[PDB]
Amino acid sequence: ASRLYTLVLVLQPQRVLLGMKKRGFGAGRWNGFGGKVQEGETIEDGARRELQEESGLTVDALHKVGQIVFEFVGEPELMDVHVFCTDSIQGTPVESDEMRPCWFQLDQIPFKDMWPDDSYWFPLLLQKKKFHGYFKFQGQDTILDYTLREVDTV
Ligand SMILES: CCc1c(C)nc(N)nc1N1CCOCC1
């Protein structure tokens, strides 16, 4: 069994929007916007809802760019993360209780202060290749196993 999650990256020609997670699991790291998909909403609707909750932004269109599965040792549920990106946003990003958003130039992405898996698949995102990933974590800092490939259909 896996649990559905979303991750949204606002990727513009020279910059990318990340949020500093202020509370909860992964507090203290920059990441895309996202979270659990709820009962009664599509995956893409959940992705839009999380983006709006965490940054106030809405979007005209989201594009599927990847799927990442996470195993955490000792946790029974796999995490099935559907990754989206967009270039056209609506609004100005604002800080929420959950996230403090900030734009980063694409050669200044703060990998040392992000989830360790981002170092592996973020390059493919920036290269606009679609990908499937798998990452097995011991705790929040240590990747024990991983796979990563480019795909044709996300
Ligand atoms: C904690 C799972 C996780 C890992 C390991 N890495 C990244 N980059 N994002 C993660 N999430 C994606 C969005 O849902 C919340 C958590």
UniProtKB/Swiss-Prot annotation:
Changing G40I: Reduces activity by 60%. Changing G46M: Loss of activity. The keyword Transit peptide applies. Binds 2 Mg(2+) ion per subunit. Changing E54A: Loss of ability to prevent DNA damage. Expected to cause loss of enzyme activity. Changing E53G: Loss of activity. Inhibited by 2-oxo-dADP and 8-oxo-dGDP. Changing W115Y: Enhances 2-oxo-dATPase activity and greatly reduces 8-oxo-dGTPase activity. N(6)-methyl-AMP binds at T6, K21, W115, P116, D117, D118. Changing D117 to A/N: Loss of 2-oxo-dATPase activity, reduces 8-oxo-dGTPase activity. Mg(2+) 2 binds at E50, E53. O(6)-methyl-dGMP binds at T6, K21, N31, W115, P116, D117, D118. InterPro entries: 8ODP (IPR003563), Nudix_hydrolase (IPR020476), NUDIX_hydrolase-like_dom_sf (IPR015797), NUDIX_hydrolase_CS (IPR020084), NUDIX_hydrolase_dom (IPR000086). Belongs to the Nudix hydrolase family. Monomer. This is Oxidized purine nucleoside triphosphate hydrolase.
